[PDB]
């Protein structure tokens, strides 16, 4: 049972859903799937308000998954609003935004150290493990959906696509992260593992999963460059780190490589990924 907020209270605390950036004095923080996330202040708490823009089933799925799943490595839904057509989700505000933005150092934020990147990777694996233990396939594991709290704790977000554990006609997810079988219509927790392997590569390299002015454009393609000995993992390590040691970087790359196996059955389960990430430290 979450808090039922009135639409006018959410409109009020977000400066009428001010579309200008926080930097300019507005309330827009960014945009998710089919929604804009705004900053607000409710009952002496900084909140994130996602205004969705059928899509109602994605809203209900987000609430249903959050009602069941409560873990330290998952975002915390505080409440919601559904007055008519304009649907809102209220969460505890994550001071350090998304892992994607922090890896890119968006808005001048300093680079994440190797030590903090390891903590985030283990945290994200714990969050996925909780989802899988509770029979849920996320279907959209990506660095934009891994938020970071006031202590850089990884928080898996966006459960609008989540499914309770197979084929489907409506294929959903982010192409640059999707597993080969997910792109074909299969719904399996093994696809979540593949997507997590892409997140690990993003953590190691600091490169986005897709960059149209880059060769290769798809980050997952670097796994083949390394395997065909054209490049090494050292060549791709994020240069914006001063504490990355080769042994732990190669240990994390070994996990990413295992997650990115083209055969879904050859990939390790989340408990094994979680085990390997703890062994790394």
Ligand X SMILES: CN1CCC(n2cc(Nc3nc(NC4(C)CC4)c4c(=O)n(C)ccc4n3)cn2)CC1
Among candidate residues 140, 149, 192, 238, the one labeled active-site is: 140
Q: Is 107 in the site for ligand X (CB under 6 A)?
A: yes
Site for ligand X in 172-211 (CB under 6 A): none
Q: Which of 10, 42, 48, 179 binds ligand X (CB under 6 A)?
A: 48
Q: Which residue in the shown chain puts its C-beta closest to ligand X?
A: 30
How far apart are the two ends of the chain, measured CA to CA in Å?
38
Q: Where are the alpha helices (DSSP H) in the chain?
A: 7-13, 55-68, 99-103, 114-133, 180-183, 189-205, 222-227, 233-236, 246-259, 270-279
Q: Is 91 in the site for ligand X (CB under 6 A)?
A: yes
Q: Is 118 in the site for ligand X (CB under 6 A)?
A: no
The answer to whether 86 is a known catalytic residue is no
Report in angstroms how near the CB of residue 15 gets to ligand X at its nearest. Answer: 16
45 Cβ contact list (under 8 Å, min separation 6): 78, 92, 93
Question: Which of the stretches 96-104, 174-182, 186-194, 230-238 binds ligand X when contact is defined by CB under 6 A?
Answer: 96-104
Q: Which of 26, 32, 208, 268 binds ligand X (CB under 6 A)?
A: 32
C-alpha to C-alpha distance for 94 and 35, rounded to whole angstroms: 17
59 Cβ contact list (under 8 Å, min separation 6): 52, 80, 82, 87, 89, 160
For residue 33, say whether it is annotated as part of any ligand binding site.
Answer: yes
For residue 29, say whether it is annotated as part of any ligand binding site.
Answer: yes
Specify the length of the chain in residues.
281
Q: Which of 45, 57, 109, 165 binds ligand X (CB under 6 A)?
A: 109
For residue 30, say whether it is annotated as part of any ligand binding site.
Answer: yes
For residue 113, the Cα-to-chain-centroid distance in whole angstroms is: 19
Q: Which of 17, 59, 93, 130 binds ligand X (CB under 6 A)?
A: 93
C-alpha to C-alpha distance for 10 and 237, rounded to whole angstroms: 42
| Cβ-based burial of 134 (10 A; exposed 0-12, middle 13-18, buried ≥19) | middle
For residue 50, say whether it is annotated as part of any ligand binding site.
Answer: yes
Q: Which of 66, 103, 146, 147 binds ligand X (CB under 6 A)?
A: 147
Residues annotated within the binding site for ATP are 29-37, 50, 142-145, 158
């Amino acid at each position: 049972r979450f808090h039922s907020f009135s639409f006018y209270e959410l409109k009020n605390v977000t400066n009428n859903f001010d579309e200008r950036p926080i930097s300019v004095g507005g309330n827009k923080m960014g945009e998710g799937g089919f929604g804009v996330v705004y900053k607000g202040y409710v009952n002496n708490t900084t909140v994130a308000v996602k205004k969705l823009a059928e899509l109602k089933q994605q809203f209900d799925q987000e609430i249903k998954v959050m009602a069941k799943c409560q873990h330290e490595n998952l975002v915390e839904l505080l409440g919601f609003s559904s007055d008519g057509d304009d649907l809102c989700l209220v969460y505890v505000y994550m001071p350090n935004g998304s892992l994607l933005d922090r890896l890119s150092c968006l808005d001048g934020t300093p680079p994440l150290s190797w030590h903090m990147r390891c903590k985030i990777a283990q945290g994200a694996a714990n969050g996925i493990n909780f989802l899988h233990e509770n029979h849920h396939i996320h279907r959209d594991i990506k660095s934009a959906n891994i938020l970071l709290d006031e202590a850089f704790t990884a928080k898996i977000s966006d459960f609008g696509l989540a499914r309770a554990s197979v084929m489907t006609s409506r294929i959903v997810g982010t192409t640059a992260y999707m597993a080969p079988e997910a792109l074909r219509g299969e719904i399996t927790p093994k696809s979540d593992i593949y997507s997590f392997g892409v997140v690990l590569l993003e953590i190691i390299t600091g490169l986005p999963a897709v960059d149209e002015h880059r060769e290769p454009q798809l980050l997952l393609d670097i796994k083949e460059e390394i395997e065909d000995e054209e490049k090494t993992i050292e060549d791709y390590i994020d240069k914006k780190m001063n504490d990355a040691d080769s042994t732990s970087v190669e240990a994390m790359y070994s996990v990413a490589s295992q997650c990115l196996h083209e055969k879904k059955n050859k990939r390790p389960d989340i408990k094994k990924v979680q085990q390997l990430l703890q062994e790394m430290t």
